Ligand binder design. Sequence first.
Ligand SMILES: *C1=NO[C@@H](c2ccc(NC(C)=O)cc2)C1
Ligand SMILES: *C1=NO[C@@H](c2ccc(NC(C)=O)cc2)C1
Lengths: 131, 131
Amino acid sequence: RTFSYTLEDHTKQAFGIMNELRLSQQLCDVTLQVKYQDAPAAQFMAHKVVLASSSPVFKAMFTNGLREQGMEVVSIEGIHPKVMERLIEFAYTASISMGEKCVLHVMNGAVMYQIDSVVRACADFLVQQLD
Amino acid sequence: RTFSYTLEDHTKQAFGIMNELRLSQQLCDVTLQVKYQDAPAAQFMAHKVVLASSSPVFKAMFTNGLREQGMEVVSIEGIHPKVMERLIEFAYTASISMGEKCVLHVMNGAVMYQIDSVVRACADFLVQQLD
Ligand SMILES: *C1=NO[C@@H](c2ccc(NC(C)=O)cc2)C1
Ligand SMILES: *C1=NO[C@@H](c2ccc(NC(C)=O)cc2)C1
């Protein structure tokens, strides 16, 4: 009677395309302007719904009961553009890479945007460096 | 040197929230108006980027090199609202359920929007009913 089916890696497939659309700057509805001290400013286009799905801070930031028209620019301060890139990548790919020296700055970014899995990851790594 | 990390079920987690946002009608940028013969019209709000990630037909339908302002209404004909609901659900949940009698109508919808995994699923099921 009730025929049901589930594609295992659909979400991984869909995020692949959603990442392709980001790199192609198609359907993006938010531009993240990152300005950090002495580093040059950098823009990052993305989809609010995707960022919200990976960061409770973005979710609350975009869920204001309003269908904002067209593009919305968000001014981000206190984080290095390099770091914001890795976090966006993680949101669209569920993965993140970096050098040992920037792990701490990524942890700060993960905390600032409450991306727990990244926080816990950098936490356990830093503890392993000890001794 | 190069510290990398990957959260396995991130995409499943993110789609959970993206589905929550749909049911809450937050960040949606497309309304699918479905009108089918004698059945009453039905609306379905969703996120273009999500639909595009699961349907090449939606991807081409929304990727026209334009950041359309606010909400866009799409007139859909030739498919029953019940069927469009299941397909949207699959896009946001990677799963789909239905009764034996409507499996064929879902296959028609999956084909119409080139959601291969659903097409192949209903295909193999119908072949199993035989004999
Ligand atoms: C990895 N995390 O931050 C990057 C970085 C870039 C440039 C500097 N230079 C000064 C003066 O701050 C430090 C750290 C590297
Ligand atoms: C499952 N697929 O389509 C649904 C349905 C609803 C209403 C009717 N009635 C007429 C006259 O077409 C048939 C099929 C059921």
